[PDB]
Amino acid sequence: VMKESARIAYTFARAFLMQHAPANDYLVTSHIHLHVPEGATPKDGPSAGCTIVTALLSLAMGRPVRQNLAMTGEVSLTGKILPVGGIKEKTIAAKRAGVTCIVLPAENKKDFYDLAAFITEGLEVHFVEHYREIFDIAFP
Amino acid sequence: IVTALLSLAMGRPVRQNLAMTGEVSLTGKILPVGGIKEKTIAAKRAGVTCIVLPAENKKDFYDLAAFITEGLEVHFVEHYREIFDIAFP
Amino acid sequence: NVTRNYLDWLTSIPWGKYSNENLDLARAQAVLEEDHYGMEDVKKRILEFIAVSQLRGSTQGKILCFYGPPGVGKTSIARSIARALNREYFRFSVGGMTDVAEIKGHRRTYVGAMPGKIIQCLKKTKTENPLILIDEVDKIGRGYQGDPSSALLELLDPEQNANFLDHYLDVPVDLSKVLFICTANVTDTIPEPLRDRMEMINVSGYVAQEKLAIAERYLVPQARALCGLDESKAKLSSDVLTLLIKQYCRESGVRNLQKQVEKVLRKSAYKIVSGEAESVEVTPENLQDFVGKPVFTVERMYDVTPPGVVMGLAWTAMGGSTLFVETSLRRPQDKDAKGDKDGSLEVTGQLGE
Amino acid sequence: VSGYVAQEKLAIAERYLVPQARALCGLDESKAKLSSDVLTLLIKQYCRESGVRNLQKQVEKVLRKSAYKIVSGEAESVEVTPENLQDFVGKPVFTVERMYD
Amino acid sequence: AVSQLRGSTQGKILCFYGPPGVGKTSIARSIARALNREYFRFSVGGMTDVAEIKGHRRTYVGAMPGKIIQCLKKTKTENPLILIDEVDKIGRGYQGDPSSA
Numbered sequence A: 001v002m003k004e005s006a007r008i009a010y011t012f013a014r015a016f017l018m019q020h021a022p023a024n025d026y027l028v029t030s031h032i033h034l035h036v037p038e039g040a041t042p043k044d045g046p047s048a049g050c051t052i053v054t055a056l057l058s059l060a061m062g063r064p065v066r067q068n069l070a071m072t073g074e075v076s077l078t079g080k081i082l083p084v085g086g087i088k089e090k091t092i093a094a095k096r097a098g099v100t101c102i103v104l105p106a107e108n109k110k111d112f113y114d115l116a117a118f119i120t121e122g123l124e125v126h127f128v129e130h131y132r133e134i135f136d137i138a139f140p
Numbered sequence B: 001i002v003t004a005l006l007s008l009a010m011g012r013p014v015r016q017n018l019a020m021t022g023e024v025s026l027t028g029k030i031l032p033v034g035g036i037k038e039k040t041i042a043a044k045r046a047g048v049t050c051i052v053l054p055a056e057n058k059k060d061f062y063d064l065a066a067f068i069t070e071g072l073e074v075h076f077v078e079h080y081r082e083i084f085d086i087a088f089p
Numbered sequence C: 001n002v003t004r005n006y007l008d009w010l011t012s013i014p015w016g017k018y019s020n021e022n023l024d025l026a027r028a029q030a031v032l033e034e035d036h037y038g039m040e041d042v043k044k045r046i047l048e049f050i051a052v053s054q055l056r057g058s059t060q061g062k063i064l065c066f067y068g069p070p071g072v073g074k075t076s077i078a079r080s081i082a083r084a085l086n087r088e089y090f091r092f093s094v095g096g097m098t099d100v101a102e103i104k105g106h107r108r109t110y111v112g113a114m115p116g117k118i119i120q121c122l123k124k125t126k127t128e129n130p131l132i133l134i135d136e137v138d139k140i141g142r143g144y145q146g147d148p149s150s151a152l153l154e155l156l157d158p159e160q161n162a163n164f165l166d167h168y169l170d171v172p173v174d175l176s177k178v179l180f181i182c183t184a185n186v187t188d189t190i191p192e193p194l195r196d197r198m199e200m201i202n203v204s205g206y207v208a209q210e211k212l213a214i215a216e217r218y219l220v221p222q223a224r225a226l227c228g229l230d231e232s233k234a235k236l237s238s239d240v241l242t243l244l245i246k247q248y249c250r251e252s253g254v255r256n257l258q259k260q261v262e263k264v265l266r267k268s269a270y271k272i273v274s275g276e277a278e279s280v281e282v283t284p285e286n287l288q289d290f291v292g293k294p295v296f297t298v299e300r301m302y303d304v305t306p307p308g309v310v311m312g313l314a315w316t317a318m319g320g321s322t323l324f325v326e327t328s329l330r331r332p333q334d335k336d337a338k339g340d341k342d343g344s345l346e347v348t349g350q351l352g353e
Numbered sequence D: 001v002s003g004y005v006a007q008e009k010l011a012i013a014e015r016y017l018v019p020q021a022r023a024l025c026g027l028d029e030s031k032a033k034l035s036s037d038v039l040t041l042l043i044k045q046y047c048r049e050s051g052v053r054n055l056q057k058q059v060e061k062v063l064r065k066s067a068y069k070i071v072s073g074e075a076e077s078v079e080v081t082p083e084n085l086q087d088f089v090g091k092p093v094f095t096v097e098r099m100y101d
Numbered sequence E: 001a002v003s004q005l006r007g008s009t010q011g012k013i014l015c016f017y018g019p020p021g022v023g024k025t026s027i028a029r030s031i032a033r034a035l036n037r038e039y040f041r042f043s044v045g046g047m048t049d050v051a052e053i054k055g056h057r058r059t060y061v062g063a064m065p066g067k068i069i070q071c072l073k074k075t076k077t078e079n080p081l082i083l084i085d086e087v088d089k090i091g092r093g094y095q096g097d098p099s100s101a
C-alpha cells in the first residue's frame, strides 16, 4: 500500500514540477532512492504520503525545507489532501520533539480542537485542503 | 475509466456531479451491470443529480420504490457514444 | 457418569414435539408490520411460505438466505419471524468456525465430549422444529483441516438432513422440520456446493429520508429502554435526527446512527440522575454539546471536478459508495515532436488483474 | 448427456416438471393452470441456461405465488396467462439476445 | 440385455458428463428403480480426506468406517447403485490424494 502511495505521490510530484517550474527536469531524468523508516501501522500508513512529496521537492529544487515543520496528510494524485486518523497522539509526539509548526488536512480541524488548551500552546497550525497551500507554507 | 481519459485528453471538465457507471465493450457497446439498487441509493446520498446506466438495466431501476427515484434524472444508454454526448457538451 | 450424562443428553431431545404454528395470514401480517419497517420483499416471501405450508398439510422446513449491507436488521428480522410463525428462536453464529466437531459434537468416547451445538438447541428450545439461524455463512472458517462448511451440507441439504447424526449420540436425528436461515454480507464468497441449495433473498439499503422514519419508532424507543429512561424526561424531536443522519454518519446501514442515538441518550441519563435538567430535551442547538462537533461535512470531496476526474458508483462489499477515479500525466508530453512511443498507461489502486 | 433446444424445454416442463412442483406446493391441478404459451414465454426470456435448473426456479416460484393468492387471496382457481404473468414474477430479465445485430 | 445372458448379475462403471442441470442425477435414481437396485448418493466433490473413503485405523480414538461401509450397511444389498458425484472437482491435495484412492 505504501508502494502505491509512493508512486501516487511520485506522479503528483512529476506533475507539480512541470506545472510549476518546467526548466527543472531532475525528477523525470534521474533515479532516486527513498527510505521511510518503519513504525507506522499499515492502516495509518497512507498518512505519511503528504510528507513524501515535499521530500522529493526539497531534493528536486535542492533548497532545504523550513525547519521543524512537522506534518502529515494523505495525497490525492490530483492535489487534494485527505483526512488521516488518530491525530491526538501524533500531536503530542510532535510536542515532545520541539515542533513549533504543523499542517493537517482541513477535514481534521475538528479533532485538533478537542485537545486540551495546554496541549496546543506553542504550536502553530495550518489546516489545508488542496496541496498547493502546503507548497507556500514550507519553502518561501 | 474512459470518461476520465477523454476528459483529460481535451482537458475540459466533466459536466458537474454527473455520476456514471457501465461496462465497456472495446467497440462502444455497453453491457449490463449488477446490483443497481445499492448503487443508486449511494449516488443519492452524494447529492447526485444525473446518472447513467446501461440500457439493459432499465428494468431493475424501475422496480425501485418511487420515493427512492424522485429527483434524479436518468439517462439510460447502450452504445457508448450516447454517454459521451450526455457528459461533456 | 459419562454414560449417565449421555442418557441425559439423549432423553432431553424432542422426538416429535412440534411447537404449533399459527397459520392465519392476518395475524402474520400484524406481527410483521409492527416489528420491522419496510424491506417488504422478505415479508412477501415469508408470507408466501406461510401460504403454502397451510395448504400442504403439515409443518414444513425450508432454507433461505438473506444478504446485504451490515446492520440492515437481518438478525432483527429473524426473531420477528420467530414469533410470527410461533416457532422457537435460537441464534447460532458460525463466522470463522473450524471445529466440525462443534457442528457435530464429539465421539462421546473423548474426554469431556458434548454434543454439537444443535443438540444443545434441541435440549433448550424443546421443539423439534425451531428456527435455527446460521449466521455469517460467508465467514465460515474454510481451512485445510477439514472444512466444516463441507460438513454443513449434511445439515442443510434437503435430502441428507433427513437422517443427520452426530458423533456424541450416534442415532440419526430428523431435522427436516427445522427452518434454516442464513445471513451473509456478500453471496459470492459462499462455497459453491452450498450456494446452490439455499434461496437468495436480498435485503436492501436505506435512503437518507428512510432512516428518519426508521429511527423515530423502532430505534429511539429501543435505546430509551436500554438507558432506563422514560419518554417523560428524554424527548428527541425528529429534526435532531435528520441533522444527525445527514451529517454525522454516512453509512447505508443503520448501525452508526444507532451508535449516535445511544450516546445521546446515555448522556441525557447523566444529565438527569445528578445533572441539571429534570427532563433533558435535545434541540438542534443543544446537540453539539452532547455529541461534540460534527465529523463529516463535505460529502463528495471534489465539487468542480478538475479535468480528468470522474465519479463512479461502486457496489462494494458493504453498501455502495461514490468513489472517484483519477488520472494524470507522468512525464512531459512533447518529449520529441517526432516521438513515436505508445503512450503506455499505468494503472494503480490495488488492481485485480 | 446433452443440452436442450428452446422448443424442447417446453415439452419437458409441460409434463415432468410442472406437475411435480404442483405437488410440492400442495395444490391440485384444478386450481393452477399454466397455458403452454406462458411456459414458452418464460423459457424464451427469463432463463438462458442449457440446463433446466433456472426455469425450474421460475415455475416453482410462480406456483407458490399462486398458493398465496389461493389460501387467503381472492381467486379460488388461479389461471396464469401471458398478460397476467408480469404481475406474478415481474418484469422481463433478458431481452437483447445477441448483443450486436 | 447382456446381464441376462451371462447368468448372474454383473457390475460395471459408467460416466456421464454435460452441462449442469440436464437431469443426470434424476436418471440415476430412475435407473435404480428400473433395474431394482438400491440407490445411495455419495458426494465426493472437493473432498481431500482419503480416510473418508476408507475410514480410519480403528486404533485412533473416534475412528469410524469409511463412507462405503455405511452405504453397504444401509442399502443392505451386496449390489447397490452407488453414485459418485463431481469427480471433476475432487480435492487433489498433498493431504493424501483421493484420486489414488
Ligand SMILES: Nc1ncnc2c1ncn2[C@@H]1O[C@H](COP(=O)(O)OP(=O)(O)O)[C@@H](O)[C@H]1O
Pocket: C035, C036, C037, C038, C070, C071, C072, C073, C074, C075, C076, C077, C214, C218, C219, C222, C254, C255
Ligand atoms: N427496518 C428496521 N426496523 C427495525 N429495526 C431495524 C430496522 N433496520 C435496522 N434495525 C435495527 O438494526 C439493528 C441491528 O440489526 P440486526 O440485523 O438485528 O443486527 P445487525 O444489523 O447489526 O447484523 C437492530 O438493533 C435493529 O433494531
Ligand SMILES: Nc1ncnc2c1ncn2[C@@H]1O[C@H](COP(=O)(O)OP(=O)(O)O)[C@@H](O)[C@H]1O
Pocket: D012, D016, D051, D052, D053, D056, E020, E021, E022, E023, E024, E025, E026, E027
Ligand atoms: N429431461 C428431463 N426429464 C425429467 N426431468 C428433468 C429433465 N431435465 C431436467 N430435469 C429435472 O432437472 C432437475 C435436476 O436434475 P438432476 O440431474 O437431478 O439435478 P441437476 O440437473 O441439478 O444435476 C431434476 O429435478 C429433474 O426433474
